Every structure is written in structure tokens, then in C-alpha cells.
């Protein structure tokens, strides 16, 4: 905004540098250290924090999605980046990040490394609470999702009021 308050286009000069070195470049005098950005969110986690990592991850995913003009609602990407950065560290979408969670063994074995997860569960005497959807599906029960996220009682009072 200008003096009158109207938004106007302004042209400034910035630098685009190949290679990653965050802290040293931020410490360089004459550089706006409050706005320096990196495309490697691992470096952002190492330097800035976890919330900045979430912001940078969302920015990268949005750039990848919207480079070709496609539009995806903000809530889906927000949920993805919240899941990825919910334990204080980056959780990769693979067997090295998903299977390391404290979820049930039945739902973890269904993704990858079924026999290894089952053997580890047998050796560690793990207990499955059957609160997820995968182990409810494999056991042929009503999963606690959608219409199964509650129970239907009988209205004795209204029937008596007849």
C-alpha cells in the first residue's frame, strides 16, 4: 500500500542461490534475515523450527500442485502437512515413517512388511485395541467411521408417552 492506502506493484531485487546454507546466509549483513527461505524443509527444521517447517512444507506442496494451474482446497494440504509434522519431526510417507507409529499391529502389517510386523508384535506382546478401521475391516465388524461412529438406543420415554 502507498500513502493513500491503495495497493500498487513495486519491483525489488532478490537473490536466488544454488545450494543450501541457511544460517550462514542469514548471518550475512545486508540480508533480510527475517525473510530468508529455503526449498529444503529439512534445513528449515534444523535452523528455524517445526512450525516454520510446516509452513515451508505447505508452500512447497502448494507450488507443486498449482504450477500447472490445478487447484486443491487448503484443508487437505493442511491436514497432510499436519500429519507429517505432528510428532515434532518429519514423518516420511513410506514404511520408514508410517510403520514407526504406535498404532495397532494389525493395521500396520496391512500396509507393508506384514510378517516382520507380526513377528515383532508376537515378540513384544503388543495389544491391539481395535479402535482403527483396518482391524475392524479385517475382522468383519462395523468400523467406527461414518454411520458406525455412534450407537442407536431405544427411546423408552417416547414409546411410553404414546
Partner 1 sequence: ELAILKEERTTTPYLTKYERARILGTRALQISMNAPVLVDIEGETDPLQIAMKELSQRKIPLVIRRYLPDGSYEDWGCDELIVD
Partner 2 sequence: GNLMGKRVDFSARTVISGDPNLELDQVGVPISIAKTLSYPETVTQYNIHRLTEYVRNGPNEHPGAKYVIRDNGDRIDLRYHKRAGDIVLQYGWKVERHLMDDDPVLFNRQPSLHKMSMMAHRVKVMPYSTFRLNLSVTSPYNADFDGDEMNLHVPQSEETRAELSQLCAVPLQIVSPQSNKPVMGIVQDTLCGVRKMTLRDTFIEYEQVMNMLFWVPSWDGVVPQPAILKPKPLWTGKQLLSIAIPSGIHLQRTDGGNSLLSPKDNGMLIVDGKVMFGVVDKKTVGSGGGGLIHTVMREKGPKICAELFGNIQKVVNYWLLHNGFSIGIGDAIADASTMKEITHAISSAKEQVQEIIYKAQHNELELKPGMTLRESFEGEVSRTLNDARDSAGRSAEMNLKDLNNVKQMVSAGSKGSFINIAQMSACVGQQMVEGKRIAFGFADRSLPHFTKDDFSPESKGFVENSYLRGLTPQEFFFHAMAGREGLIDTAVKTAETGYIQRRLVKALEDIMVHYDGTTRNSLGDIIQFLYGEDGLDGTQVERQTIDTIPGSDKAFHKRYYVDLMDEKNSIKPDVIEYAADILGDVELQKELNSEYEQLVSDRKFLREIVFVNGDHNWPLPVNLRRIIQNAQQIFHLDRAKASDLTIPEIIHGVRDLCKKLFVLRGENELIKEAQQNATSLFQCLVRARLATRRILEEFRLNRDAFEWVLGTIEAQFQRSLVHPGEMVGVIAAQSIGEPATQMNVTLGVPRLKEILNVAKNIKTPALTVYLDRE
Partner 3 sequence: VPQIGDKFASRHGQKGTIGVTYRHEDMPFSAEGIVPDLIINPHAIPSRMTVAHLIECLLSKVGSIRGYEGDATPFTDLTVDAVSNLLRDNGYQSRGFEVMYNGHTGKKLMAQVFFGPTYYQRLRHMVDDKIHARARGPVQVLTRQPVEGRSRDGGLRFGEMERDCMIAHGAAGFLKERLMEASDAFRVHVCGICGLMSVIANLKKNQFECRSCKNKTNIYQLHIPYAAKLLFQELMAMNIAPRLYTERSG
Write out the residues near partner 1 by the rule CB under 8 A: 144, 146-147, 149-155, 157-159, 162
Place of cell 404414546: 162
Residue bearing cell 525489488: 12
User: Interface with partner 2 includes 115 (CB under 8 A)?
Assistant: no
Site for partner 2 in 34-63 (CB under 8 A): 35-40, 42, 57, 60-61
C-alpha–C-alpha distance, residues 53 and 44, integer Å: 6
* 116 counts as binding partner 3 under rule CB under 8 A: no
CA 139 – CA 122 distance, rounded (Å):
18
Q: Which of 23, 49, 51, 72 binds partner 2 (CB under 8 A)?
A: 72
Binding partner selected for residue 119 from partner 1, partner 2, partner 3, none, CB under the kind-specific 5 to 8 Å limit: partner 3
| Residue of 78, 145, 135 whose CA lies nearest to 111 | 135
| Residue 124's binding partner out of partner 1, partner 2, partner 3, none, with CB under 5 to 8 Å set by partner kind | none
Amino acid at each position: 500500500p502507498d500513502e493513500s492506502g491503495e495497493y500498487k506493484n513495486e519491483e525489488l531485487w532478490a537473490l536466488e542461490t544454488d545450494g543450501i546454507n541457511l544460517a550462514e546466509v542469514m548471518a550475512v549483513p545486508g540480508v533480510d534475515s527475517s525473510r530468508t527461505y529455503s526449498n529444503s524443509f529439512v534445513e528449515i527444521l534444523s535452523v528455524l523450527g517445526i512450525e516454520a517447517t510446516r509452513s515451508s512444507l505447505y508452500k512447497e506442496i502448494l507450488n507443486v500442485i498449482a504450477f500447472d494451474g490445478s487447484y486443491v482446497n487448503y484443508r487437505h494440504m493442511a491436514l497432510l502437512v499436519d500429519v507429517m509434522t505432528s510428532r515434532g519431526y518429519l514423518m516420511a510417507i513410506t514404511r520408514h515413517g508410517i510403520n514407526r507409529a504406535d498404532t495397532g499391529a494389525l493395521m500396520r502389517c496391512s500396509f507393508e512388511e506384514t510378517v516382520e510386523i507380526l513377528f515383532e508384535a508376537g515378540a513384544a506382546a503388543e495389544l491391539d485395541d481395535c479402535r482403527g478401521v483396518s482391524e475392524n475391516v479385517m475382522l468383519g465388524q462395523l468400523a467406527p467411521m461414518g454411520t458406525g461412529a455412534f450407537d442407536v438406543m431405544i427411546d423408552e420415554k417416547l414409546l411410553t408417552s404414546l
